[PDB]
């Protein structure tokens, strides 16, 4: 892995851990092969470089960009506050936030890789290919982020 | 010029919103004098400009609210940049440091800087070494257009 590719992962990883401990809900979608320009246009265009600080700033509660999904295209944030499709599978708990139903939702209609931070639990969750992995450790998140991103 | 009038509206509407809520803000737009020296002081963004993103950067306690946002052309080159503070004896000493930061970058370059006072909520501007205080919103858009797009 490139030195920069690792810098990005620690940036994203450090941001997720900050939000995890403070129970800040967060929802970040990483584009893979399926084009997500339909969903990127849902929100406010950023086309911005990544840094931990930006990631945290976007999800601050009572912030204009916290409501919705941040969508990442390659090494850039394509948009924030995107509306993703919500999922209807009856196997989602219903004790689970809209963010979670959105991430499995986008997981059903594309190959995208999405990380969710539960505003109520602080657990780190991941979705891809219609499948959900819940309450992963930081080590596993960095492991999985790298595979799907790079 | 249509694209410019929407950028001016983006910047102007955000500045007024922060003004009414007494949110401190400090934004410098570069013209002729390169600031890449100061842009490297802060967090690299290279981000498109939008009303929501300007406001999110300066929400109090946001990791980027402390410092200067620097704008290059139609993009935000960096946020939370360190500008040099000025030592002129006509400065109130009755004003937050944000004011003296804009008078600082005004002395060493031709840059155009806007300030929103955290304690007062008034709108100020600096260029060519002098500070102009509590201008109206109508006047602020006129000067921004003048200095940003010639």
Q: Which two tokens stand for residue A114?
A: 């999405």
What are the phi and psi torsion angles at B110 (to 5°)?
A: -85, 10
- Sequence-ordered list of residues with C-beta below 8 angstroms from that of A88, at least 6 positions apart, any chain: none
Q: Where are the alpha helices (DSSP H) in chain B?
A: 3-20, 36-39, 51-57, 97-108, 137-149
Instruction: Give the Å distances, CA to CA, from A112 to A107, A108, A119, B93, B146.
Output: 6, 9, 22, 53, 44
- Nearest Cα residue to A52 out of B59, B43, B54, B38: B43
Q: Which residue of B has its CA nearest to A58?
A: B56
The DSSP bridge pattern shows strands A69-73 and A76-82 to be: antiparallel
The H-or-E segment that residue A15 falls in is helix A3-21
Inter-chain Cβ pairs, chain A and chain B, closer than 8 A: 62
Residue numbers in A near B52 (CB within 8 A): 44, 64-65, 80-81
Contact between residue B88 and residue B49 where contact means Cβ atoms under 8 Å apart = no
Tell me which chain A residue has its CA closest to the CA of residue B66.
A53
List of domains in chain A: 1-150 (3.40.1700.10)
CA distance A109 to A103: 10
Angle, CA of B32, B34 and B37, to the nearest 5°: 160
Q: Which of A62, A65, A67, A51 is nearest to A18 (CA)?
A: A51
Q: Measure in Å the smallest separation between the Cα of A58 and chain B Cα atoms.
A: 7
Closest Cα in chain B, distance from residue A150 (Å):
21
Where on the phi/psi map is residue A70: left (φ > 0), alpha (ψ -120 to 50), or beta?
beta
Q: Which helix (H) or strand (E) holds B43?
A: strand B43-48
CB within 8 Å: A57 and B55:
no
Measured in angstroms, the resolution is 2.8
Q: Is A47's CB within 8 Å of B43's CB?
A: no
Classify burial at A42, counting beta carbons within 10 Å of its beta carbon; exposed 0-12, middle 13-18, buried 19 or more.
middle
Contact A129, A103 (CB under 8 A): no
* Location of structure tokens 């944000």: B98
Report DSSP letters for A18-34, one per residue.
HHHHTT--EEEEE--SS
The method of structure determination was X-ray
Q: Where are the beta strands (DSSP E) in B53-136?
A: 68-72, 75-81, 112-116, 123-127, 130-132
**Residue tagged 């401190």 (tokens):** B24
Test the A interface: residue of B3, B45, B69 with most A CBs within 10 Å = B45
Cβ partners under 8 Å of residue B33, min gap 6: B108, B109, B110, B111
In terms of CA atoms, which chain B residue is nearest residue A63?
B56
């Amino acid at each position: 892995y490139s030195k920069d590719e690792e810098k990005l992962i620690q940036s994203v990883s450090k941001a997720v851990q900050y939000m995890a401990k403070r129970r800040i809900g967060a929802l970040i979608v990483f584009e893979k092969e399926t084009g997500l320009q339909d969903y990127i246009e849902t929100g406010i265009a950023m086309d911005s470089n990544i840094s931990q600080e930006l990631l945290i700033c976007v999800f601050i509660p009572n912030c204009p960009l916290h409501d919705g999904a941040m969508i990442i295209q390659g090494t850039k944030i394509a948009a924030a506050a995107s509306y993703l499709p919500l999922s209807d599978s009856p196997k989602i708990s219903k004790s689970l936030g809209t963010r979670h139903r959105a991430a499995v939702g986008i997981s059903e209609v594309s190959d995208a890789f999405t990380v969710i931070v539960s505003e109520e639990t602080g657990d780190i969750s991941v979705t891809f290919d219609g499948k959900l992995r819940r309450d992963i450790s930081n080590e596993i998140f960095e492991e999985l982020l790298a595979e799907h991103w790079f």
